[PDB]
A = this chain, B = another copy of it.
Amino acid sequence: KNRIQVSNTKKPLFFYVNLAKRYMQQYNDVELSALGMAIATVVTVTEILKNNGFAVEKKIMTSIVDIKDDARGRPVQKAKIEITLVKSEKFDELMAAANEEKE
C-alpha cells in the first residue's frame, strides 16, 4: 500500500515526491524502487525529501537482478534500487509551515 515503483516516463518528478509524502503521512514509511534509467528518479526524490527535511532513510540498496526478456531469449540484467524512507520529526511541521499553518 505504501509502495512506489517508478517506471512511467510520462510522470513529472513531483508526482513521485508528493506520492511518497502522502504514503509517509499515511503509513509512516514508504518504499521507492526503480530499475536502470529510473534509479535517477528515486535518487532525486530521496535527496529532495532528505534535504528539505521531510524524511530520513532506513534502507538504501541497489542490486543487479535478472529480468524476463522474451526478445533476448534469456533474461537480461538490470540495476534495481529499493529505498525505504520514514517520516522525520520535522515532517508534520513542514507539511503545514509551507501552508502558514504551523502552530
* A interface with B by C-beta (< 8 Å): 6-7, 9-15, 34-41, 43-44, 46-48, 50-52, 57, 60-64, 67, 69, 71, 76-79, 81, 83
Contact = CB atoms under 8 A, between A and B. Distances in A.
A3 B41 CA distance: 25
Contacts of A38: 9, 37
A68 B88 CA distance: 22
Given A9-B7, A60-B62, A61-B61, A39 B43 contact: yes
26 contacts: A6-B9, A9-B35, A9-B37, A12-B48, A12-B76, A14-B51, A14-B52, A15-B76, A36-B44, A36-B47, A37-B43, A39-B40, A40-B40, A44-B44, A46-B64, A46-B79, A47-B77, A50-B64, A51-B76, A60-B61, A60-B62, A60-B63, A60-B64, A60-B79, A61-B61, A62-B81
Number of copies: 4
Nearest to A77: B50
